[PDB]
Amino acid sequence: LQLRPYQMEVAQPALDGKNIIICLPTGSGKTRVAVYITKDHLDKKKQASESGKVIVLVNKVMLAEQLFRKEFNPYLKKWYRIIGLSGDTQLKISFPEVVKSYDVIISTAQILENSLLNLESGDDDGVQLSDFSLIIIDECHHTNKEAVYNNIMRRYLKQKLRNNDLKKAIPLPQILGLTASPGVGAAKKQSEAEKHILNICANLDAFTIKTVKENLGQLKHQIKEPCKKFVIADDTRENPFKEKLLEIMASIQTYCQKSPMSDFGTQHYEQWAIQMEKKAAKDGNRKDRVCAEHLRKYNEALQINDTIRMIDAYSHLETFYTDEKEKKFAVLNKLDETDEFLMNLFFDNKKMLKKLAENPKYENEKLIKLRNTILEQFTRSEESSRGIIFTKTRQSTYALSQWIMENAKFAEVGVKAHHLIGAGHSSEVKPMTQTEQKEVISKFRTGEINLLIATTVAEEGLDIKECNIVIRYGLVTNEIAMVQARGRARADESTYVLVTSSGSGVTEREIVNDFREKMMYKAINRVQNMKPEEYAHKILELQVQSILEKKMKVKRSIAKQYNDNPSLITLLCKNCSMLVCSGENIHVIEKMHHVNMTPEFKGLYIVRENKALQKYQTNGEIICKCGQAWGTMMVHKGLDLPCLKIRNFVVNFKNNSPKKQYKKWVELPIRFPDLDYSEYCL
RNA sequence: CAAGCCGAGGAGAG
RNA sequence: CUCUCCUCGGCUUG
Ligand SMILES: Nc1ncnc2c1ncn2[C@@H]1O[C@H](COP(=O)(O)OP(=O)(O)NP(=O)(O)O)[C@@H](O)[C@H]1O
Ligand SMILES: [Zn+2]
């Protein structure tokens, strides 16, 4: 391992106590300075006959294996014992015991918190911080309100204040936070920015920040920025299609008699549709809620039309209505006035919309703009042409990947492309799996795919190869994502583009984040040059305030929903105001999954075979007689006992009918009994 | 590989 | 404070 000139000075105070933060730019060898500090700490604690254990904390799963393979093990295999832990191994089970060996631990975080609270809640073995001598951290800037890793530090600070009251002493460990930039936390002034930086430093018990300032030229030579760049377009033709949908929506409303006080093709209208649906369901009146459920789909179609082709919206709708027709046929294998009206309104115009959509006379601007942007680079760079795209949604990524596969020009220039999204199981899309992600990364590194389409997955964590033409298509989150993307593009003649529309304030937000970036550095300078006594005074005040802001939050949120009422309810279907279950019939397995095993509920539903699995069904999707999907099948002890949700159902209390929607099971106060086979059997 | 439970952060709009 | 979008983590059934 090598010791750069400028990494030295930033690391230097850490080597003798002095818990600190380190903010360097991106690509400056952050992991490697971590490694060096580790080796020093351990060699030191050996030379003094003192036990030395370092633990690395990360936020993601892949960075653990990552750092185990590339940085820590290749250099410290020979002197010390290393390991890498996560939620995707089997070493989680005896975590108190791996500590008894393996002087270098890498870990996902909440492993640790689980073990601490197990030591402090049950009679398990567990662990405390006293069994360490260093905590290294990646991505400092997540240390904010009740995240994970701040429990850790609130406990560290609690014990530190115990030590300080003792002084007027357990040996507490050392802490070394590493980041790219701690970030201004949503503050409209330089002073509140300062306050936020100090809040971070208190939540890490720091002594300084240690930005590089002296050996700066070596950085500028070894490390460089891309060039910021904007590309803007404007559109007022909307020629056949938009109005062809606004007509439909207007017709539906004037069939429903609901006045939005708002516009078509935006986000407030959506919120109205939601609360109207929820109200109609709490009341029970149809003709309003199902229509709302469709209007939401139309609004989504218009929003994606603002960014994506008409054909993608037409397809989105085709999928929706095709599914609904299949549902009604599976049920009927009756035809209310509502659904009949809606279908008759849609399918008559289906062929028209298909004709209007395929019309290259007016496709879109931003797509053409990025066409020009992309072709410029891949004509310039010629087989060293890596590429990245950022967008907001997942469906957009599928659409863009499809298009770049379809249009000949992009394939001509060697533009081999793949999509990428996250593994969260929500949001009406089939997510990806970690394996597909890692494979795509290795394909990018290999060179199979020249450009990647991504959501906010790409701006942090996983280690993509250095790039050229990072762009930004309809996304401005905050300064952090801005800088982290801005730190991808090495490989000279790099850029950082932003592609937006005219009448949607985005360049606004881009500029705001630029000013925030320029502000946090001023605040860093304000605090590094702060006097030590005043700095100490302020961090002590903030640590006290943070620990007091925990206690209160603890006092008002012990349970907040505790009234356990076994069967005081009835669960109805939300589409059709129809009985489905009572609360007594329901039970729980492994105190997590809710389920019912009475034959009355058995006969009411229908199973529609899986499209997720076709990409032999194992987990059927339930539907009603009406058509509203309810749940999913489940296999407990071979019993195909069918699970369910509480997002599609409605509640009716027996007393006075404040019917409510909950969106998930924990929110409601009442408790349900555990399962046991004594019922239906014996 | 599929299903689901809980928690957390960020951003928009209101 | 609510809704939507996005990401992440831990945990269970198969
Ligand atoms: N001190 C060092 N000496 C030699 N090579 C280094 C050093 N630090 C980093 N490298 C090289 O830089 C690459 C890994 O470091 P780097 O690119 O900073 O990854 P990183 O830690 O993820 N940067 P970042 O994305 O900001 O966290 C490899 O090609 C290493 O060979
Ligand atoms: Zn129903």
Numbering used by the authors: 307 to 474, 479 to 643, 668 to 949, 954 to 1020
Would you copy out the relevant sentences from the publication that reported this structure?
Helical reconstruction of the filaments formed with 1 mM AMPPNP in RELION produced three maps with an overall resolution better than 4 Å (3.68–3.93 Å). The maps had distinct helical twists of 74°, 87°, and 91°, respectively, but similar rises (43–45 Å). The low-twist structures (71°–81°) contain 14 bp of dsRNA in the asymmetric unit and density for nucleotide in the ATP-binding site. The nucleotide density ranges from absent or weak in the nucleotide-free structures and the 1-mM AMPPNP low-twist structure (Twist74), respectively, to strong in the intermediate-twist ADP-AlF4 structure. The protein-RNA contact area decreases as twist increases, with 2,315 Å2 for Twist74, 2,102 Å2 for Twist87, and 1,926 Å2 for Twist91. The CTD forms stronger RNA contacts in the Twist74 structure than in the Twist91 structure (849 Å2 versus 471 Å2 contact areas), whereas the opposite is true for the Hel2i domain (293 Å2 versus 321 Å2). The CTD capping loop (residues 944–953), so called because it binds to RNA blunt ends in RIG-I and LGP2 (Li et al., 2009, Pippig et al., 2009, Wang et al., 2010), is disordered in the Twist87 and Twist91 structures and in the MDA5-dsRNA crystal structures but partially ordered in the Twist74 structure, in which it forms contacts with the RNA backbone at the minor groove, as had been predicted (Uchikawa et al., 2016). For example, the C-terminal tail forms contacts two helical turns further down the second pincer helix in the Twist74 structure than in the Twist91 structure, and the Hel1 interface loop adopts a different conformation in Twist74 than in the other cryo-EM and crystal structures.
Uninterrupted RNA duplexes longer than a few hundred base pairs are recognized in the cytosol by the innate immune receptor MDA5 (melanoma differentiation-associated gene-5; Kato et al., 2006, Kato et al., 2008). The cooperative assembly of MDA5 into ATP-sensitive filaments on dsRNA induces oligomerization of its tandem N-terminal caspase recruitment domains (CARDs) (Berke and Modis, 2012, Peisley et al., 2011). The helicase consists of two RecA-like domains, Hel1 and Hel2, and an insert domain, Hel2i, all of which form contacts with phosphate and ribose moieties of both RNA strands. The helicase and CTD, linked by a pair of α helices referred to as the pincer domain, form a closed ring around the RNA.
